[PDB]
Amino acid sequence: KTRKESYAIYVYKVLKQVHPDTGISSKAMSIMNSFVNDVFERIAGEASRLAHYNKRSTITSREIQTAVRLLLPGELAKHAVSEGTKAVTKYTSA
Amino acid sequence: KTRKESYAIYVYKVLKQVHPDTGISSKAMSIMNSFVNDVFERIAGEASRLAHYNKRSTITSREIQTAVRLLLPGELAKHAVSEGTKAVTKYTSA
Amino acid sequence: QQPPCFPLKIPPNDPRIKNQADCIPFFRSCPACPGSNITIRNQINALTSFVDASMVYGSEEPLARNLRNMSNQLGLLAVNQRFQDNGRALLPFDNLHDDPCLLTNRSARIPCFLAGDTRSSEMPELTSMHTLLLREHNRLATELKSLNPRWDGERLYQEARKIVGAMVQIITYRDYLPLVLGPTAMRKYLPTYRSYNDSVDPRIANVFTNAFRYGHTLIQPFMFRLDNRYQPMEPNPRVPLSRVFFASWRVVLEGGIDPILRGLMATPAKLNRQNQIAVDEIRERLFEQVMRIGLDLPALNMQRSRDHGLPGYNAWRRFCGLPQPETVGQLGTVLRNLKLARKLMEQYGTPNNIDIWMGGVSEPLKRKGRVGPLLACIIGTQFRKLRDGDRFWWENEGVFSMQQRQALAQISLPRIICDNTGITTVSKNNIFMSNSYPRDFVNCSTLPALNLASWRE
Amino acid sequence: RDNIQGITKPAIRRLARRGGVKRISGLIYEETRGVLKVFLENVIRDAVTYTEHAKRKTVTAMDVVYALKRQGRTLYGFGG
Amino acid sequence: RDNIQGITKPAIRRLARRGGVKRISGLIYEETRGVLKVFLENVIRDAVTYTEHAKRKTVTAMDVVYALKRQGRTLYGFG
Amino acid sequence: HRYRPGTVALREIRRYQKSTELLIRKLPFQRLVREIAQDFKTDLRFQSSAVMALQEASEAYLVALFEDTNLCAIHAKRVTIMPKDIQLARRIRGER
Amino acid sequence: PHRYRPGTVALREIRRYQKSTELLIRKLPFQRLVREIAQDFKTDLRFQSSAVMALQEASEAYLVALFEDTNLCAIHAKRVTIMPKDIQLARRIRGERA
Amino acid sequence: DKYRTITGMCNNRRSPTLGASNRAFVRWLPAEYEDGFSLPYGWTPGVKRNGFPVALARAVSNEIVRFPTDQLTPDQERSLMFMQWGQLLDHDLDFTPEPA
Amino acid sequence: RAKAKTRSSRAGLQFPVGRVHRLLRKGNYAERVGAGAPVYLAAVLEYLTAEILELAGNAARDNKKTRIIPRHLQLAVRNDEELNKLLGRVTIAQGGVLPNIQSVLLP
Amino acid sequence: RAKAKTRSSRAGLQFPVGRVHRLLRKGNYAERVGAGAPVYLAAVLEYLTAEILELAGNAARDNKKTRIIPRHLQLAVRNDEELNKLLGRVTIAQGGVLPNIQSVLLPK
DNA sequence: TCGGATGTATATATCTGACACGTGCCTGGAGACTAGGGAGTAATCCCCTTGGCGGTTAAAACGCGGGGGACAGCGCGTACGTGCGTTTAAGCGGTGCTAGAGCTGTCTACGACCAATTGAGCGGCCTCGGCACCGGGATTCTCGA
DNA sequence: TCGAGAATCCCGGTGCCGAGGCCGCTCAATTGGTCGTAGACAGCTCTAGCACCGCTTAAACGCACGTACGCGCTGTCCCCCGCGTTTTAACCGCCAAGGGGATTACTCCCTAGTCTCCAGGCACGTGTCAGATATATACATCCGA
Ligand code: HEM
Ligand SMILES: *[C@@H]1O[C@H](CO)[C@@H](O)[C@H](O)[C@H]1NC(C)=O
Ligand SMILES: *[C@@H]1O[C@H](CO)[C@@H](O)[C@H](O)[C@H]1NC(C)=O
C-alpha cells in the first residue's frame, strides 16, 4: 500500500506535551491534520506573493515573518512571531 | 529611465477592432490593464491548483480549459472555451 | 399595373434592359383575408413556424402522407423509382402542370423533385441537402427497426422524424447561429436555456422574411464540383450559376450529390463588403432560362419589402434600441462609410426611407459575425422566440431522456455527410468554418457515430 | 424523481431549531428547499467538473472538499 | 489630533444619498465615523506592514492595492 | 396535561444545540444528491465520504442561514420567520 | 414664500448624486485622518498622493455599499428612517461584526 | 400531446392555433402603406413618402448593390455550407405564397 | 533562417502569446508549461477584453461621447449579469453607482 | 560520517523541519527556499497546534471526558476571539453550534 | 403558590471496538563537497513629498419653523404549536457481483535549454480636437389656489 | 385642474490640455537543434460501490383545538427636513528644500545539486479500557388551582 504521510505523530506529540492525560480520536485527528495543512498553505502562499512583489526569488524567514504578521490576528500573531524567532536563534546556535 | 510593460497596445488593438471610431482615456486604460492582469492571475492560479491536485508537473490546455469552466460564470464560460479551442486548432494548423 | 401584379419599373440608362417600357415581372403576396379593405393587409406563412425539419416531412397532412413510403411497415420515406446515385436513394419526382425543371434542358426530360418544400429544386446544392436529410431519415428508420423489431411502421417513422428534427435544431443552434451573430450578439440575444415558456410567441415576424435575405450576399457566381481527391472534377468543374437554376438534370445525370457536397465542404464563401454587396450573376442573370428575362435579387428584395408594407430603416433602428441617423454625417458615422452614405441619401433623401434589407446589409459587420447590429438584433430575437416558445424543444424536459440527450449532443454535420453517402474525407469541427483542403480535413474514421443503444425499449 | 420532497418538514424544523428559531411560518419550507437545491447544484457542478478533469467516474470526497474550498466554504474532517 | 470630525455631517449625508437613503436619523453620523475608522485602521495597518517589509518609508499606491486585495476588496485603476 | 405554545419549541432549541448529529435522513439526501448530479453526467458513482461531506456542508449552510433569518425576523419586531427574512438575509450576504 | 415639502429635495439629491462619479468627502480632512491613523503603526511615514486617493476611493465605495444594505434593513422593518440598529444588523449579517 | 402535429396546431395550450401554418404573419411594428390600408409605396406615381419621392428599387440595385465581378473577395472563415444551411433553415421556417 | 513570425499571428490573435508564455513560465505556477496553454489563455483574455470593451463603447455612444471613461466601464459591467457576477468583489475607480431608488421611497 | 540529528531536534521542535522544507521546495512557491524558513514555519505551526489543543483539552476536561472529539475542537475555537477570527469561514465536521438563545424569545 | 405530572440529569452494571503501542522495513532526510549567481553593500541622481503663503469663495455651522414619520396602544381573526393515532420507509444486518481505481512497465515525443538574430514594443516628442466650462433660453416638475 | 416659481436641461462660443500618432533603440521573442524525462498507453489486481432482501420500529403524516401572535387602524408629538445668514477653511497657484526611491558596481555567501547511508516514520497486528447503552432514581421545571 502506498504511504500517506500526515501530521498525526507530531500533533500527538504536542498533545502529550500539553495534556499528558488526554487522548484524541480519529475524526479530531483528521480535523487537526486539515487545520495544519490549511495554515501551512495560507502562510506559504502569502510568503510567495510577498517574494514576487519585491522582485526576489527566495523565500526567507523575513517573508515568513511578514506573512505571519499579515494573516494571524492580533495577539496570536505576536506570540507566533516570538516562537518562530526563538527557533531560528536556537537553530543558528547549533 | 526604465522599461515597464503593460497590456496597453493590445487593448487598443481590440478596441479598434470592436469600435473603430471610439477612443479611450488613461484611467480607463489603467482599469482595463488591471482587469487583464487580475483575470490572468485567477485563471493561472486555478490551473496550477488543478495540475497539483492530479500530481502533474505541466500546465496544458486541459488545465486552462477546466480553470475557465470553473471560474467564468454561465454562458460566458462556454463562449470563452470555444474561442480558446479555435485558437489552439489554428496554432496547430500553422 | 393591375392587381395582383406589381411590376418593377426600369429607370433610364439601364445597363441590361435597354427598353424603358419593359418591366421586371413581380407578383404581390396573397392577402391573409381578401375581399375587405378596412382590415390592414397581412401575408400568409404557409409553413410551420418551428425548427422541426418541416422541409423534409411537409407542413400539411396530405403532402406529409404522400411523402411516406406507404407500401411497407418500416416507416420509411418515398424514394425515386427510376434513378439512383451509385445505388443510393434520391428524392422522388413530382408531377406539376408547369415544371420549370424541364425548361432548363428539354433533352434530359427530368422533372422537379418532391420534398416537404416546393422550392427544393432551385439548385443542385439545395437538392443535395434535401437528399442527404432523406437518406439520414431512411438510415435512422432502418437502424431503429433492426434494433427494435417490435415497433410498427408509424412508431418508427415518428421516432426517426423526432430524431431528425432534434438533429436539425442542435446543428443550427450550436454551429450556425454563433457564426452569424458573433459571440457578443449570441450571448445577448440567445442566453442559456431555462425552460419552456407558454407566454412566448413563436410566430415568424414579417420583417424576418426580409431580414434573413442576408444570405443573398454570400452567394458565389459559380457552382464547384470536386472528385474523390477534392480536385476539379471534369467535365465542367465550375458551372456558371445562371445555368444551374432549376436544373435537376445536373444531379441525376451528372454524378449525383457527392461532388456537390465535396464542393460545398471545401470552398470559401463570398465576403460581404460595403462596396461589393451582391454578385452580378444573381443581379442580372437570375432564372434566365426559365423566365423571359433575368431577374434581380436585390431589386426583388426591396420591392417585396415595399409590398409587405414594412417600416423604414430608422423605425427598426428605434425598435432595436440603436441610434437613429438624421443627416448625411450621422449616416456616415453609423455606416463607417461616407461614399455609401452619400449614395444612399442621394437615392432616398432621408434615412427613414431606406429599405430594411439595404440598410441591414449596408452596415459594418459585427466582430466574428456576418451581420450588422440591426440584422443581428432581429435575427437573434426571432430565434430566441422560436427556441423558448417551442414545446418540443430537444432540451425541454420530457421530450428526450437524459441518456438520449447525451447521445444526441454528439451529432455533427460531417458525420452525417460521410455516413449517408460516399465521401470519406470531411471537414473538421464547425464544418461551416473549414474551407481549405487538406489543411482542416479528416477521414471521419475518428468522429464517433450516433449511439442509438439508448433508444432500445 | 421528486426527491426534493425527501427533505421533509420535520427535518427543516429541526434545522431551524438548531439555528435558534422558535416560531416558523408555513411558507418557509418551500423557500428552504429552493435554497438547498441551489447550493447543492453549485457545489455538485464544481465537484463533477473536478472529477471530469481527472478522467474518473466516481466523485471522491476530495473533489467535494476542493469544490467547497472554491466556493469559500472550507470543510475540515474529510480528506486533507 | 481629532481629525475624525473632519468627516462632516453633510459629507455623510452625501454618501447616504448616493446609496439611495431618503431619511436619516441623527445618530448615524457617529456610528458611520466609527465604522469608517475601523475599516481605515485595518487597511492602513496592512499597507504599513507591506511598506515595512520592503524596507521603505513611503506608503506607495501598490501597498494600498495589495492591502485591499488581501481583504477581498480588489480595486481597479491604481496599478 | 398540555404545555403552552412555545415551551416544547424552546426545549427542542436547547436539545438540538447540544447535539452534533445530522438532522436530515441519509437515504433521501443521497437520492437527492444523485438526482441533482444526473443533470451533469450520466452513470456517476459516489464515495460514501463524498455524500457525507455534502450533507455536512449543506446542514452547516442551512443552520447559519437560519440564524441570519432569525436575526432579520427579530429586527422587524417579530418572533416567526417568514420567507422575506430569508430573502433579505441572502440579499445582504450577497448570495442573491 | 415658496417651500418644498419634506422628502422632495432629498429625492433630488438622491437622483443627482447617483448620476455623478466624484468624491463626496473633502480631500484635506481625509488625508489628515489617514495620516493620524497611520501615526500609530509607524513614525515619520510619507504617503504618495496615489495612496491617499486609493484609500479614499475604497472607503467611499465601502460606505456606499454599507448604506445600501442599511437602507434595505430599514425598509424591512417598515420604516423610511435610517437608524444605527440597521447598520449593526447589516454589518452582522455581512459578517463584519458577527 | 406526445408528438408534433404536422400542421403545428395544439403546440400552445393557451392558443391552439398560435404558431401553426397557413396563418397571418405577426407584425412587430404597424404596417406603413402609401394610402393607409393596402397600397404599397410606388403604386400611384407622383406620391411622395415622408415628404420625399419614392426611389425605384431597380435603380438602387443598379448604382448601389452593383460591383464588377472580378473584384470578388472570398471569405477565409466560412464555407459554402454556411450559405446552404442558411437557405435550408430558411426554407424550414417561412414561406409566403403568391397567386398564380 | 526564415523570416520570423509571431505566435499571435499564427494563432490569429491580437494579445501576445510569447509574453503570456513567459509570464506563465516565470510566475511560479508549475514545473513545465505546455505549448498550447499560452495560446488558450491569450484567446480567453482577448475574448473577455472584447466583451468588456464592446459593452463600454455602447455605453459611451449612448452618452453622446467619443472616449471611454471609467463611468462607462462601470455601467457596462454592472448592467450585465455575467460580468457583474464575475467582478462581484471589484471596485472600479471613478465608476460611481447605478441609478436605483426603492419604490417605497417614491411619493 | 557522524551521528545524524534531525533539524527539528536542533531547533527544539516537535514538528518536522525536513518535511516542511521538502513541502516548500515541491510546492511551487518560489525558485529558492532559505535555510531558516522551514524552522520558522515549523515553529509557527507547532505554536498554533499547541494553542488549539490546549483549549480543546480544557473543553474535554470541563465535559468530564478524557478524549478530544470534534465537538471539543469546535467549542474551543468558537469561544476564543483570535481563533474564531482565524477560522471564521471554516466548517468543522460533527462540531455542532454554540448554544445561544436570543433574549427576545425567552418567556417574560 | 402548593401539589401533580412530564422531562431530564445522575449513578450503577455490561459489553465492545477503536485507540494506543510494538515491530519490520523502506525511502527520504542528513552529512560531506562543489559551483554559480542572487542579494547585500556602497555610491550617485534627481524626483516628488513636505512645508509655507495669500486670495477667493464654496461649503460647513447655526438657528428656526412646521409637518410627517416613529412608536405606543388596542382590537381581531387566523394560523401555527401541541398532542394523538395511523401509515411508511429508514436503518440494520448479511450476500453477491463487478466496475474501475490504483499500481507496474515501456517508450516516445514534448518541453527545457542553449546560441544567434532582429524587430516589436517602450520612451520621448509634438500636436490638434474632444471636452469642460461660459453665456443664454426651453421645458418640466412641484406646491399653493 | 391651473398658474408661479425653481430646477434641470438643451444649444452656440472658447480655449486647452490630454489622447493619439511618429521616430530610435534595445532587449525580449523567434529560429534551429539536443536531450532526457514526464506522461501516454497496455495489462492486472483487488477494493469498494451498487443492487436485493427481510424486519423492526422510529419517523413521518394527517387531524383537531385553541391560543397567542401577526396585522391593521388611531393618535400624539417630537425629531428631522428645508431654507436663510454668517463663518470657516478647503482649494488653487506658486516657491523652495531635501529626504529617499531608484539605478549601477562588485563581490561574497548562500543555496541548488550529487552520492552515500541509515534511522524516522509508515503499514500491519493486538489487546484492553474509555465510552456507548440499559435501568432505576431523583431533582427541576411547568401549568394549573
Ligand atoms: C443562394 C441563392 C438564392 C436564390 C437564387 C434565391 C432565390 C429567391 C428568390 C427570387 C426569392 C423571392 C422572394 C424573396 O427574395 O424574399 C426568395 C425567397 C426568399 N429567400 Fe432566397 N434565394 C437564395 C438564397 C437565400 C438564402 C441563402 C437565404 C437565407 C439565408 C434566403 C432567404 C429567403 C427568404 C426568407 C425568402 C422568402 C420566401 C419567399 O418570399 O418565398 N434566400 N429566394
Ligand atoms: C417505397 O416505395 C417504393 C416505390 O418506388 C418501393 O420501391 C419501395 O420498396 C418502398 N419501400 C420499402 C421499404 O419497401
Ligand atoms: C415568459 O416570457 C415572458 C415574456 O418574455 C416573461 O415576462 C416571463 O417572465 C417568462 N416566464 C417565465 C416563467 O420565465
Residue numbers in the entry:
A (entry chain D), B (entry chain H): 28 to 121
C (entry chain N): 121 to 577
D (entry chain F): 23 to 102
E (entry chain B): 23 to 101
F (entry chain E): 39 to 134
G (entry chain A): 38 to 135
H (entry chain M): 5 to 104
I (entry chain G): 11 to 117
Wording from the paper:
Here we show how myeloperoxidase (MPO), a highly expressed neutrophil protein, disassembles nucleosomes, thereby facilitating NET formation, yet also binds stably to NETs extracellularly. We describe how the oligomeric status of MPO governs both outcomes. MPO dimers interact with nucleosomal DNA using one protomer and concurrently dock into the nucleosome acidic patch with the other protomer. On the other hand, MPO monomers stably interact with the nucleosome acidic patch without making concomitant DNA contacts, explaining how monomeric MPO binds to and licences NETs to confer hypohalous acid production in the extracellular space.
To further determine the role of disulfide-stabilized dimers for the ability of MPO to evict nucleosomes, we chemically reduced the single disulfide bridge between monomers in native MPO dimers, which efficiently dissociated the particles into stable MPO monomers that were still able to bind to nucleosomes. In cryo-EM, we observed nucleosomes bound by either one or two MPO monomers or by one MPO monomer and one MPO dimer through the same acidic patch interface as in the non-reduced MPO. We used the reduced, monomeric MPO in our GATC cleavage assay. Notably, under conditions in which non-reduced, dimeric MPO efficiently allowed DpnII cleavage of nucleosomal DNA, reduced monomeric MPO did not promote cleavage. Only at a 16-fold excess of reduced MPO did we observe faint bands corresponding to the cleavage product. This is a further indication that dimers are required for the ability of MPO to displace nucleosomal DNA and disassemble the nucleosome.
